[PDB]
């Protein structure tokens, strides 16, 4: 039992970690994983989780174990990490830059079934010319703009859809599908508006696929998604897969959109109280914006949580206390309502540990080299995640 | 050689000639004021950047985390001030650094934190050097500049408890809400006077107070005189940023840190160029939104570093930035001006926030080559 005794001596808990730390409540993370996978199984579509929220091998392993099919990545560094870890079905869902083609070629030549996306004739021409030069039939999907959010060919822009699809297909590449991301779902906050946007996202992606196929071009995959529209879609006829990422943890922006409650948020930042300004009702904590990130997505929503909702050590919300301000390594904990708490030092004594729910899980997670994955027994384990490009 | 044409994007680029000018300007101002400069490395967390600050005449550093103290001590820097109210649970970490030879200084602003340090120091045989943080402007931590009984209670806990009461410090961070030389000069004087007043109160009580330490970059550059001050702490000046430009202490052309980005697409009807520098590259900091000129997620510059006024990142998602006209109009033929693959450089709202998004900087020399300069992430 030499290993056992030594490992027990080294095991951390929420009391022994240094702060700040990004804590994943594994039981909440597994409920979120199951909820999404079950919804997609009920819809008869594949779930291709977007790992840009955690960039962590063990978190994606849990998603794969639950039934996910492949992943979506936001950078080729994520494709390199997850392919090294055994994931071969990877979609790089950012408009392809020609200068990154040698790295995408190398990944495919090592055995990664890496898919790229474009939304322009010039990007299609760059991929097809390099593929012909290098003897590589890249798989390329066409990105569709279904809601005005960001990149993509308009769903009704048949001439440009065909021009890009022909450039790829005639060029000897594999035109593998269409995808869309209805990111404007983050501006909504009612179930009726989310359900309608989910239907516009489905209808527009399938419209683009049907236009390509009406021109004789292959388009076997139809991929949609954002977490809110994944959870709100009534029907997904014509869709092969849904992509969703932030759901794995949720956050307060998702709580305000209405697709989860604060009790579903699996990621919190463990912080210590390091001081006060008693006459202003401030407790000062060691989670500033370097821990929380500068994300303030809740500022324009129905309930502004400042730099995060305060919870006790046990992870239960402490209503009315939020981080009202943040500097790099100092957070200002005070009443959301703008009163000065009396006796703030008795409410929050020096050295008290608290947990802060984030505005945006993807933004807060990226501030940490690793998560501390919290098991039901109170034990944590360090789960590394990727930083940079 | 690696150059701005060969790097992958996004990348954090330091223009070394601009950084050296910013380093010289600050050190020459501190020398003119008769005070030491103790740079705050939380902006770069990079050994070669702090080396350049030391070569120019800096005396010790300030750090925002013990991880920084570990990094810089492993690189040979021993005169380290950890300028965040000390948490008692980090005392074992601080003790081990001191026992290894790091001359690590801690700060406190409460009797309870001072008692925890003094009790642990006596148990472990360690006379911790502790400074008392003074609140001169209501920004953040510190003993109020008027609150003499609290100041003396802490000073006596430390000195009677066997610890080394090494000084007082203040950080007038409310300087970042100002934007005129008269208001910055007045706040710099309030910061100076408040910190010197606390030192005098300690000394009048028979307590040691050899160091009087003030600073933020705007008050460091605006102070007219620094009588009674021994050192100034400043950090973001090494690179500057657009929040600094709006406060009025630099020009956009002085900003030494930019994010190299590639154009990866367009929305021509809206006049957008989409770049691969989203908020993961720039950070979510939007400090210019509250100032007199809003630069969105950053100011566009060409690959040579020429500022392109009127183009900014008007929006950002994680790995996509939206480049568009600041005047709200849809640039006609945006794709013809910025073809796919064009490289641009984006000046940040907040240098300390943008830098923390990158594992390393790319230090750009006069000949156009780059050298990778690692920086620290995490705690
Ligand atoms: C982020 C992202 C997703 C996942 O959206 P969430 O709302 O985080 O689930 C899907 N597709 C693309 C292209 C994305 O960038
Ligand atoms: C950040 C910081 C500084 C340096 O301020 P800048 O405006 O970045 O130069 C000085 N002192 C303390 C305590 C700080 O936190
Ligand atoms: Cl700060
Ligand atoms: Cl995003
Ligand atoms: Mg997100
Ligand atoms: Mg690389
Ligand atoms: Mg006060
Ligand atoms: Mg700063
Ligand atoms: Mg540490």
Spacing, Cα B144 to ligand 7 middle (Å): 4
B267 in Cβ contact with A145 (< 8 Å): yes
Asked if A246 has any chain B CB less than 8 Å from its own CB, the reply is no
Q: Which residue of B has its CA nearest to A367?
A: B378
B160 in Cβ contact with B121 (< 8 Å): no
Are A17 and A59 within one domain? no
Are B122 and B230 within one domain? yes
Which of A226, A250, A265, A297 maximizes ligand 1 atoms within 8 Å of its Cβ, making it the mutation to test the pocket?
A226
* Pocket, ligand 1, Cβ cutoff 6 A: A 50, 52-53, 72, 93, 181, 225-227, 243-247
Are B149 and B89 within one domain? yes
Are B216 and B263 within one domain? no
Are B341 and B292 within one domain? yes
Q: Which residues of A211-234 are buried (b: 16+ CB within 10 A; e: fewer)?
A: bbeeeebebebbbbbbbbbbbbbe
Are A263 and A237 within one domain? no
Q: Which of A97, A295, A332 sits opposite B284 (nearest CB)?
A: A295
A147 in Cβ contact with A156 (< 8 Å): no
Spacing, Cα A64 to ligand 5 middle (Å): 20
Identify the domain containing residue B44 by its residue range: 16-238
Q: What are phi and psi of B350, to 5 degrees?
A: -135, 110
Residues B38 and B57: their CA atoms lie apart, in Å, by 10
Closest CA to A144 of A168, A169, A176, A179: A179
B143 in Cβ contact with B133 (< 8 Å): yes
**Ligand 2 in contact with B286 (CB < 6 A)?**
no
- Residue having the nearest C-alpha atom to atom 5 of ligand 1: A226
Q: What is the dihedral of CA A284, B173, A329, A335, to 10 degrees?
A: 30
What tokens were used for A176?
């593998």
Residues A324 and A346: their CA atoms lie apart, in Å, by 19
Residues of A in Cβ contact (< 8 Å) with B359: 387-388
Closest CA to A286 of A303, A307, A305: A307
Residues B273 and B325: their CA atoms lie apart, in Å, by 10
Are A311 and A322 within one domain? yes
Q: Which of B8, B84, B113 sits opposite A329 (nearest CB)?
A: B84
| Domain end among A184, A215, A248 | A248
A 294-313 near B (Cβ less than 8 A): 294-296
Task: Please state, in angstroms and as integers, the Cα–Cα distance from residue A205 to each residue in A147, A178, A341, A351, following that order.
Answer: 11, 7, 51, 53
Residues of A in Cβ contact (< 8 Å) with B42: 328-329
Residues A206 and A221: their CA atoms lie apart, in Å, by 10
CATH number at residue A15: 2.40.37.20
Which helix (H) or strand (E) covers residue A322, if one does? strand A317-326
What tokens were used for B189?
């004087």
Spacing, Cα B92 to ligand 9 middle (Å): 11
Are B29 and B65 within one domain? yes
| Domain end among A217, A248, A279 | A248
B 121-160 near A (Cβ less than 8 A): 135, 138, 140-141
Distant-in-sequence, close-in-space partners of A168: CB < 8 Å, separation ≥ 6:
A118, A124, A127, A128, A140, A142, A174, A175
| Domain end among B202, B221, B238 | B238
Which technique was used to obtain these atomic coordinates? X-ray
Are B64 and B111 within one domain? yes
Return the residue matching tokens 């109009």.
B329
Are A50 and A12 within one domain? no
What tokens were used for A207?
């419209």
CB atoms within 10 A of CB A43: 17
Q: Which of B135, B319, B353 sits opposite A294 (nearest CB)?
A: B353
Residues B107 and B111: their CA atoms lie apart, in Å, by 12
Resolution (A): 1.5
Residues A205 and A210: their CA atoms lie apart, in Å, by 9
Distant-in-sequence, close-in-space partners of A285: CB < 8 Å, separation ≥ 6:
A271, A272, A273, A274, A323, A330, A331, A333, A354, A356
Asked if B377 has any chain A CB less than 8 Å from its own CB, the reply is yes
Are A108 and A198 within one domain? yes
Return the residue matching tokens 């900014």.
B312
Closest CA to B207 of B170, B279, B158, B171: B158
Residues A199 and A207: their CA atoms lie apart, in Å, by 12
Count residue pairs from A and B with Cβ separation < 8 A.
Answer: 145
Are B353 and B341 within one domain? yes
- Residue having the nearest C-alpha atom to atom 11 of ligand 2: B171
Residues B280 and A60: their CA atoms lie apart, in Å, by 20
How many distinct structural domains can be found in chain A? 2
Residues of A in Cβ contact (< 8 Å) with B348: none
The ligand that comes nearest to the alpha carbon of residue B109 is 7
Find the DSSP H helices in chain B: 16-33, 47-55, 66-74, 91-100, 111-124, 148-160, 181-204, 217-222, 242-247, 279-282, 334-337, 351-355
Greatest C-alpha distance within chain B: 73
Q: Does A94 contact B320 at a Cβ distance shorter than 8 Å? A: yes
Q: What is the dihedral of CA B258, B259, B264, B270, to 10 degrees?
A: -60
Asked if A46 has any chain B CB less than 8 Å from its own CB, the reply is no
B114 in Cβ contact with B151 (< 8 Å): no
Spacing, Cα A205 to ligand 4 middle (Å): 19
Q: Which residues of A244-274 are buried (b: 16+ CB within 10 A; e: fewer)?
A: bbbbbbbbbbbbbbbbbebebbbbbbbbbbb
Q: Does A95 contact B339 at a Cβ distance shorter than 8 Å? A: no
The sign of the torsion formed by the CA atoms of B17, B20, B24, B26 equals positive
CATH number at residue A169: 3.20.20.10
């Amino acid at each position: 039992h030499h290993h056992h005794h030594h490992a027990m001596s080294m095991q951390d808990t929420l009391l022994t970690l240094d702060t700040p730390a990004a804590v994943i409540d594994l039981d909440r993370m597994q409920r979120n994983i199951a909820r999404m996978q079950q919804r997609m199984d009920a819809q008869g579509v594949r779930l291709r989780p977007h790992v840009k929220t955690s960039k962590s091998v063990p978190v994606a392993a849990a998603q794969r174990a639950a039934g996910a099919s492949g992943i979506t990545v936001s950078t080729l560094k994520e494709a390199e990490q997850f392919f090294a870890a055994g994931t071969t079905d990877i979609l790089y869902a950012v408009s392809m830059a020609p200068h990154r083609l040698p790295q995408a070629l190398q990944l495919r030549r090592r055995g990664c079934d890496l898919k790229l996306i474009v939304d322009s004739v010039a990007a299609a021409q760059a991929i097809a010319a390099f593929g012909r030069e290098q003897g590589e039939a890249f798989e390329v999907w066409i990105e569709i703009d279904t809601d005005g959010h960001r990149s993509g060919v308009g769903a009704d822009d048949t001439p440009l859809l065909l021009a890009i699809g022909r450039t790829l297909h005639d060029g000897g590449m594999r035109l593998g599908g269409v995808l869309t991301h209805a990111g404007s779902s983050y501006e909504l906050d009612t179930p009726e508006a989310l359900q309608a946007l989910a239907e516009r996202e489905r209808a527009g992606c399938v419209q683009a696929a049907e236009a390509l196929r009406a021109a004789g071009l292959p388009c076997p995959v139809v991929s949609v998604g954002s977490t809110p529209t994944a959870l709100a879609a009534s029907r997904l006829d014509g869709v092969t897969e849904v992509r969703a990422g932030v759901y794995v943890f949720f956050d307060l922006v998702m709580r305000n959109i209405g697709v989860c409650a604060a009790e579903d948020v699996a990621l919190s930042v463990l912080a210590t109280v390091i001081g006060h300004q008693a006459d202003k009702g401030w407790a000062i904590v060691d989670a500033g914006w370097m821990a929380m990130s500068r994300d303030r997505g809740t500022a324009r929503q129905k309930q502004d949580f400042g730099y995060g909702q305060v919870c006790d050590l046990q992870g239960r919300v402490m209503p009315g206390f939020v981080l009202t301000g943040a500097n790099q390594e100092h957070g200002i904990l005070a009443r959301a309502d703008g009163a000065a708490e009396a006796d703030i030092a008795t409410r929050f004594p020096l050295g008290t540990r608290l947990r802060i729910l984030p505005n945006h899980a993807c933004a807060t997670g990226a501030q940490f080299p690793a998560y501390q994955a919290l098991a039901a027994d109170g034990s944590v384990q360090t789960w590394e995640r990727l930083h940079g490009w």
